[PDB]
């Protein structure tokens, strides 16, 4: 057998000795501090496990146990939330009337006049309005009572302590060997079939037996109280056959292969629930079933201990064309002997996933009563755009850490990796052009519109009334999705989303979904999206390809991943390291995602969101100003930023006045960053010397000598304040704007 369990017993003694010696993990820091730079190095190097030991087995043991610690903090986080929903919320009052009661799971103490933050939300309750969608998620599970939330909170605490115990057990008591970690084919079979497959099967089981029948009674108008205990849905088929009259057959049409009997709970109707404005739970139960069969079957594609199956190595090595040379040879050693190469894939995938997740939750809203909560819709969408943005660049950082540290030329003669490095001047110069081509056109469309309008010539602007730029490719695709129910998807009753066209869904007088028409003002913005992604890719790609050498520095790989420069000769060598490429690309991701959430917040408010009256008279939030006000920069500056600021700037004395303070606080922090980004270290260290003198004059000085922040560190400070202040100012602007319109 090749797949076995290898574990070392009693590997590391558990004592408080090392806790009292900061910097024990590295060879240079263990001597103790001499300057204040030591304190900074202590934190920057604490998780760099690769630079602490040379053994791959010891690095892998540290990573494994740290995953248990990360999960234990997530369980504690989840257990808190459920606890707040059970003791500091208005969940019951919300369940009885989820159109008038606003949501809240946080209560502040009254101590310095801050009680004003407890808003008058409803249901004889005062608290801070929360926009995480905990409530809607609980209704979809069929919660209905605070008691049930309490058990989740106790079970979250127990799981959290189980994780803490497992991470301690696997690092000190039962430390598993290197052979165990290097089992990719086994690991893939378990994550596909076990984690994802049995996860979707059991979840589907909860949805069919507990979540489906409770939701049917809530939707029909039954008060929570009259709904029976969830376990009573598991015992009496009489209760289950009244709602879905195919339980009288039981489980026999499943083993006879007559699955169309269950069309009561395995639907493919599409659209949304006219009552709640969320997806049909019956579609979601079918969704998890079809997934779980796919995941369990996919977890049999690899060979472990029995002959049958694929070896990952013979797959990749078979793929070689006459342009690619050796093709995929060597990518195994890479992806089974280096943790950096793994994160580079994984973070790029998980970050892309969170972006994908945010696009699908506003167009096909999966929870009930969430589509008309515009504060939740807006908050959840931007959040995943940010988390997606950070993880994507984080994949590119580890790709460049891999090229510097784990990459070897002898392991890769003439393969795809070796070949990319060989024409790296061609990838970068061609990308460079595509960037100069996309920016001059997409941003120059706005300038033209800014000058034409200012010169009194609107007849010559790129608009829906002048020179049109109609997005005909995306309009063509919308028609296909609209005509799809019946033809291309003959068993589908309605379209996947109403964005491609169809009818208007409304819950409580508010609009949940509407067709989203695309015109030339849409078209122009989509290129800005195109353009800012291509530039971000230009910086990160360049950092990975030139991580080891350049024409400028031939021995860049000997200097390391993150070095400040190679001196003021050879012209300027500042920011040549691949860490500095990651540093620059963080500012672009920021630039790119900011335009995305600006585009989403304004298009939804202009052309979807709003209320209605008799004869379907739709009144939008900003009244349809999107086709003729977003084609110029002045229109974006005056109608989006200036007009919609009125809430956050007039929030004083109200319950949303914390958003006005955090608004100013983040404008302050953002400006504070510019002191670190524009200046440099040797002006600050001379400044410290005059200060130290005033201390020496008075007979005292710290024995840990004060030293200015280093070149690399002064950049990482200025970037962290730039993001914090920038994202924060928008955070405060988005919530005080959307709480006032929801």
């Amino acid at each position: 057998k090749n797949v076995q369990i290898f574990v070392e017993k009693d590997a590391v003694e558990t004592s408080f000795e090392k806790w009292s010696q900061p910097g024990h993990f590295s060879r240079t820091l263990a001597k103790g501090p001499k300057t204040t730079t030591w304190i900074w190095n202590l934190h920057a190097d604490a998780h760099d496990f690769d630079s602490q030991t040379n053994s791959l087995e010891e690095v892998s043991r540290k990573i494994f146990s740290a995953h248990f610690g990360q999960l234990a903090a997530i369980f504690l986080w989840i257990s808190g939330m459920h606890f707040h929903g059970a003791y500091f919320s208005n969940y019951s009052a919300w369940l009885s009337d989820p159109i008038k009661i606003k949501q809240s799971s946080q209560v502040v103490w009254p101590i310095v006049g801050q009680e004003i933050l407890n808003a008058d939300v409803g249901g004889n309750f005062q608290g801070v309005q929360t926009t995480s969608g905990w409530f809607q998620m609980w209704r979809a599970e069929g919660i209905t009572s605070e008691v049930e939330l309490y058990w989740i909170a106790i079970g979250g605490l127990i799981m959290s302590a189980l994780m803490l115990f497992a991470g301690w057990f696997h690092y000190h008591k039962a430390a598993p060997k290197l052979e165990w970690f290097q089992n990719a084919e086994s690991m893939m079979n378990h994550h596909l079939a076990g984690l994802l497959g049995l996860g979707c099967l059991s979840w589907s089981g909860h949805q069919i037996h507990i979540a489906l029948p409770i939701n049917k009674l809530l939707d029909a108008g039954v008060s929570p109280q009259e709904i029976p205990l969830p376990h009573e849905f598991l015992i009496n088929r009489d209760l289950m056959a009244q709602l879905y009259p195919s339980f009288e057959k039981g489980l026999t049409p499943f083993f006879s292969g007559q699955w169309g009997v269950y069309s009561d709970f395995l639907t493919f109707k599409g659209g949304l629930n006219p009552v709640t404005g969320g997806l049909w739970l019956s579609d979601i139960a079918h969704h998890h079933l079809a997934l779980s069969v796919l995941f369990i079957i996919a977890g049999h594609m690899y060979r472990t201990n029995w002959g049958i199956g694929h070896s990952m190595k013979e797959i990749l090595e078979a793929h070689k064309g006459p342009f690619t040379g050796e093709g995929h040879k060597g990518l195994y050693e890479i992806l089974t002997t280096s943790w950096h190469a793994q994160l580079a894939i994984n973070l790029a995938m998980i970050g892309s996933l969170s972006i994908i997740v945010a696009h699908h939750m506003y167009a096909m809203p999966p929870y009930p009563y969430i589509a008309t909560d515009y504060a939740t819709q807006l908050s959840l969408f931007t959040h995943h755009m940010w988390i997606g943005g950070f993880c994507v660049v984080g994949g590119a950082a580890h790709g460049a850490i891999f090229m510097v540290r784990d990459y070897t030329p002898a392991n890769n003669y003439n393969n795809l990796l070796d070949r990319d490095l060989r024409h790296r001047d061609e990838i970068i110069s061609n990308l460079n052009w595509v960037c100069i081509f996309l920016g001059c056109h997409a941003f120059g469309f706005y300038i033209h519109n800014d000058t034409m309008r200012a010169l009194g010539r609107p007849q010559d602007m790129f608009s829906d009334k002048a020179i049109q730029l109609q997005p005909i490719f995306a309009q063509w695709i919308q028609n296909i999705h609209l005509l799809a129910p019946g033809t291309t998807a003959p068993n589908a009753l309605a379209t996947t989303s109403y964005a491609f066209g169809g009818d208007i869904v409304e819950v409580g007088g508010k609009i949940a979904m509407m067709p989203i028409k695309l015109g030339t003002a849409d078209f122009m913005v989509h290129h800005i999206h195109a353009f800012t992604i291509h530039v971000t890719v230009l910086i990160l790609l360049k950092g990975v390809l030139y991580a080891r050498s350049s024409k400028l520095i031939p021995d860049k790989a000997n200097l390391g991943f993150r070095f400040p420069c190679d001196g003021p000769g050879r012209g300027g060598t500042c920011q040549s390291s691949s860490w500095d490429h990651v540093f620059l690309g963080l500012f672009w991701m920021y630039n790119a995602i900011s335009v995305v959430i600006f585009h989403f917040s304004w298009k939804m408010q202009s052309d979807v969101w709003g209320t209605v009256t008799a004869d379907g008279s739709i009144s939008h939030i900003t009244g349809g100003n999107f086709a003729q006000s977003s084609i110029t920069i002045n229109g974006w500056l005056r109608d989006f930023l200036w007009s919609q600021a009125s809430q956050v700037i007039q929030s004083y004395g109200s319950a949303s006045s914390a958003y006005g303070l955090i608004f100013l606080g983040a404008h302050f922090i953002w400006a504070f960053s510019l002191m670190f980004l524009f200046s440099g270290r040797g002006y600050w260290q001379e400044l410290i010397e005059s200060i130290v003198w005033a201390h020496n004059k008075l007979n005292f000085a710290p024995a840990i000598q004060p030293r200015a922040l280093s070149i690399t560190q002064g950049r990482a400070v200025g970037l962290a304040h730039y993001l914090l202040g920038g994202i924060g100012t928008t955070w405060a602007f988005f919530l005080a704007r959307s709480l006032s319109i929801t």
Binding site: A410, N412, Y413, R419, R422, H423, P554, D555
Partner: protein, 132 residues
């Protein structure tokens, strides 16, 4: 006797045939793969090896990787467009890190650094404080 390489776009430019170009020679006891300063990989040939580069640093960077990583030792040349060659590294066959009888003093101030003159003293002259 050029090593085994499939080519790359990071090689020499016009500067080579118009301005000075550099070659480097080394002797290897066996066939081993090394990293190119302008390219990712290449197999060196047993016996003498000849490589053409565009900068002195690129040539010297390869030497450093050939020294403490493979235990071998090399010669640098400057080649002009007309055809005149120059012999550069090592200057006198002996490495610059090891003292060799016969070398001379170039560019040495016979005092410590705090002993330089004020810039107002050398006013209106065509020099500098560190050239006195």
């Amino acid at each position: 006797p050029s090593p085994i390489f499939g080519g790359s776009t990071g090689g020499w430019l016009r500067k080579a045939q118009v301005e000075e170009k550099y070659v480097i020679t080394w002797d290897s006891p066996k066939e081993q793969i090394f990293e190119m300063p302008t390219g990712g990989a290449a197999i060196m040939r047993e016996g003498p090896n000849l490589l053409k580069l565009a900068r002195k640093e690129q040539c010297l960077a390869l030497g450093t990787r050939l020294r403490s990583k493979y235990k071998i030792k090399y010669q640098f040349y400057r080649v002009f467009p007309n055809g005149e060659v120059q012999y550069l590294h090592p200057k006198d066959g002996v490495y610059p890190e090891k003292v060799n009888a016969g070398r001379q003093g170039v560019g040495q101030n016979f005092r410590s650094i705090g002993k330089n003159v004020s810039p107002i003293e050398v006013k209106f002259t065509g020099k500098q404080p560190y050239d006195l």
